[PDB]
Amino acid sequence: PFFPPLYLGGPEITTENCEREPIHIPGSIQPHGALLTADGHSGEVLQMSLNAATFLGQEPTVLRGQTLAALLPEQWPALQAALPPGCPDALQYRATLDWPAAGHLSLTVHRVGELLILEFEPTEAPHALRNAMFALESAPNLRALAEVATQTVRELTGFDRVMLYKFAPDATGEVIAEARREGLHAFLGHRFPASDIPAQARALYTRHLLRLTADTRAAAVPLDPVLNPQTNAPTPLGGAVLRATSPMHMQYLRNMGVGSSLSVSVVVGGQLWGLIACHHQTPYVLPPDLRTTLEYLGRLLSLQVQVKEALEH
Amino acid sequence: DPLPFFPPLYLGGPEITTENCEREPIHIPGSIQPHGALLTADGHSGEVLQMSLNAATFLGQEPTVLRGQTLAALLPEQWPALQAALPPGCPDALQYRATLDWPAAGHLSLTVHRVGELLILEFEPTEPHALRNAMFALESAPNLRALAEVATQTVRELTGFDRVMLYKFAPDATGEVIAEARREGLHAFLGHRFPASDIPAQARALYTRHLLRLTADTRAAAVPLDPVLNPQTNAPTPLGGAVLRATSPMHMQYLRNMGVGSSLSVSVVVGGQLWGLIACHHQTPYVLPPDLRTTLEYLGRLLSLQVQVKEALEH
Ligand SMILES: *C/C=C1/C(=C/c2[nH]c(/C=C3[NH+]=C(/C=C4\NC(=O)C(C=C)=C4C)C(C)=C\3CCC(=O)O)c(CCC(=O)O)c2C)NC(=O)[C@H]1C
Ligand SMILES: *C/C=C1/C(=C/c2[nH]c(/C=C3[NH+]=C(/C=C4\NC(=O)C(C=C)=C4C)C(C)=C\3CCC(=O)O)c(CCC(=O)O)c2C)NC(=O)[C@H]1C
Question: Residues in domain GAF (chain A)?
Fold first, then answer.
């Protein structure tokens, strides 16, 4: 099982007890967006990230009273239809909001039990995705598929390094393709222990297929209140991309000289086959619409890996 | 009985009947649908060889002027990209797409693929989070029926088509409509089954490699290529990978008898086999722009993946 989180008097995490860190409930988010939780029926805002005034423009404790019906009149009915009670936590709905102060905001919502989790990020206001799709499909074998996938993603994103990281049957990792900027260490061909991506992370990544750390030196922003009023318990944040990254993994990234990290799960036959794993040397917030392109490529690659491995075997 | 293709009509081949359906060489009709234009060019020199007879209307140029230039002169910014995207020996399924600002005809969508030493260039006029929301909705559908229903409803909302069907093949190649979204007043095809010969063997083979085809207007006359044969080979120009390809007259007749003015389908391919089609009808003629068709192409791949995932749970 998991330990209690740090904010509920749980022990500090070390290399001895990696597997037991409750990474899904850090009680905090990354500072490049804002997060609100809300009741499923009433639409009453229960928790907010302390930075919410920056993004939303409203005052701190005035939001706590209001309902989503009031705040988001046009979207609140769509949210009720899109995310009905009993739907999975993996199901997400997105909209673009013309907010007065902050301009265009991306809104991403999902449901966990009776709670709606709302994420707000800045956002902007072509054929590279279609061209990529056809390129992946005409790759003659798994090796070429891997090369095309890493190169495509680097071209779409500008990331300093993009790797395809394949899990062996014992969860040992191997870098089987790599696209990188000139003047970086090559990780191509190297292998890494299973504990670098511990079992609870692997399980989470089988269900929610994208996660990132935008800035490996940025401080997390707590939720207020930290605990969910409904349950007096931790708010599950595993399906929230804004979730704070495990401090252990943030230290690991800094030791590698990485300023920004992102990965996308490749899932084949219900199992985590591998990751499209990205690094940038400097901090880097990839905008939500470009992340959606990588999410699409995750599904396409999942399909193409099966197709290609049927030819291998 | 599987039998090889007849020569096309323009090489003295016989007229097609219900007795010889399967032998129609549907891939080499020598003609296109009138809502776009098509050019062929030599893959190394870029010399323009064939053009649809309507090419002047779309490109705003004299045919003799078009044919007297290379693609290097005609498309100075695209030509190097084409060469890089479509290297010699690449499969004919591989497509490169770009948007052009053409003075006489506004924004054109350019779609290119390579067959041997020939480049085939298709030109069509072109012009928020629905796809992402659809992706997650499809993945959360609890079983195969719910997946089929969400998929048909989603395609109908995106396109406005009068009818959208999920058409599933049985092992004997008969087909059945297993879900549909339809306009009010249309009679249901749900549960109906159809013979294998309605989608003959050469079409099914073609539809396993090239995953989208359409007939924008079921009464429109086809536009010949000029010249009709490829000058490189003095043989027919393969058009199986061109969406502008003229549709079999036999299928056009079938659609007119049903009261269908526009038709479109997307292949659902599972384990290298044609599992089914997303099949769409409109009562009036209807041109879906290339960027909206790309959304349906993505959905085709997602559905292929999800059908495999849902059927694995059904065991
Ligand atoms: C005591 C536990 C340890 C630990 C924990 C840990 N690791 C992750 C997540 C990731 N680790 C990754 C590992 C690599 N990245 C690379 O670039 C390479 C090789 C060149 C490796 C082996 C990756 C890719 C992830 C996923 C996240 C990402 O893409 O950045 C977590 C979970 C983090 C989270 O989601 O909150 C945890 C708890 N890592 C260790 O090395 C030991 C000390
Ligand atoms: C003598 C040959 C015949 C024949 C040939 C034929 N049919 C197609 C293509 C299609 N037929 C389809 C059939 C149906 N559409 C429906 O809506 C229903 C039922 C409600 C059925 C059974 C479909 C979906 C296609 C695919 C194209 C499309 O989506 O419109 C071809 C190939 C056409 C081409 O690609 O050029 C051919 C040669 N059909 C017959 O019925 C017999 C007379």
Answer: 141-305
Instruction: Tell which residue, A227, A296, A240, A293, has the closest CA to residue A107.
Output: A240
Q: Round to whole Å and give the CA distance between A290 and A272.
A: 23
How many C-beta neighbours within 10 Å does residue A280 have? 22
Helix (H, G, I), strand (E, B) or coil at A253: helix
Question: Does A206 contact chain B (CB < 8 Å)?
Answer: no
Q: Classify residue A67 by its DSSP letter.
A: B
Residue to mutate (ligand 1; options A12, A209, A252; most atoms within 8 A of CB): A252
The verdict on B189 touching A (C-beta cutoff 8 Å) is no
Residue B18 Cβ inside 6 Å of ligand 2? The answer reads yes
Spatial CA neighbour of B201 closest among B80, B28, B26: B26
Residue A164: strand pairing partners: A177, A276
* Cα A40–Cα A46–Cα A47 angle in degrees, nearest 5: 125
Question: Residue ranges of the alpha helices (H) in chain A?
Answer: 52-56, 62-65, 68-71, 75-82, 128-138, 142-157, 199-207, 247-255, 288-312
Among A74, A119, A127, pick the best mutation site for testing chain B contact (most B Cβ within 10 A). A127
Alpha-carbon gap, residue B22 to B6, rounded angstroms: 9
Domains B1-125+219-247 and B126-218+248-315 equal at CATH topology level:
yes
Superfamily of B126-218+248-315 according to CATH: GAF domain (3.30.450.40)
Q: Residues B266, B296: contact at Cβ < 8 Å?
A: yes
What one-character DSSP code corresponds to residue B32?
A: E
**Method for structure elucidation:** X-ray
Distance in Å, alpha carbon of A49 to nearest chain B alpha carbon: 25
Which ligand has the nearest atom to the CA of A178? Answer: 1
Ligand 1: nearest atom to the Cα of A13: 1
b/e per residue B139-166 (b: at least 16 CB within 10 A): bbbeebeebbbbbbbbbbebbebbbbbb
Indicate the SS3 state at residue A48.
strand
Partners of A223 in the beta sheet?
Answer: A49
* Topology (CATH level 3) of domain A1-122+217-245: Beta-Lactamase (3.30.450)
What are the boundaries of each domain within chain A?
1-122+217-245, 123-216+246-313
Spatial CA neighbour of A2 closest among A234, A166, A159, A190: A234
Contact B122, B251 (CB under 8 A): no
Phi-psi region of B268 (alpha: psi -120 to 50; beta: other; left: phi over 0): beta
Q: Which CATH number fits domain B1-125+219-247: 3.30.450.20, 3.20.20.105, 3.40.50.10260, 3.30.70.360?
A: 3.30.450.20
> Quick one: B224 exposed, middle or buried, by C-beta within 10 A (0-12, 13-18, 19+)?
middle
Q: What CA–CA distance (Å, rounded) separates B146 from B135?
A: 14
* B109, B244 Cβ separation under 8 angstroms: no
d(CA B128, CA B192): 35
What resolution in Å is listed for this PDB structure? 2.1
Class in CATH terms, A123-216+246-313: alpha beta
Please name the amino acid found at residue A196: D
Closest by CA to B203, choosing from B175, B226, B234, is: B175
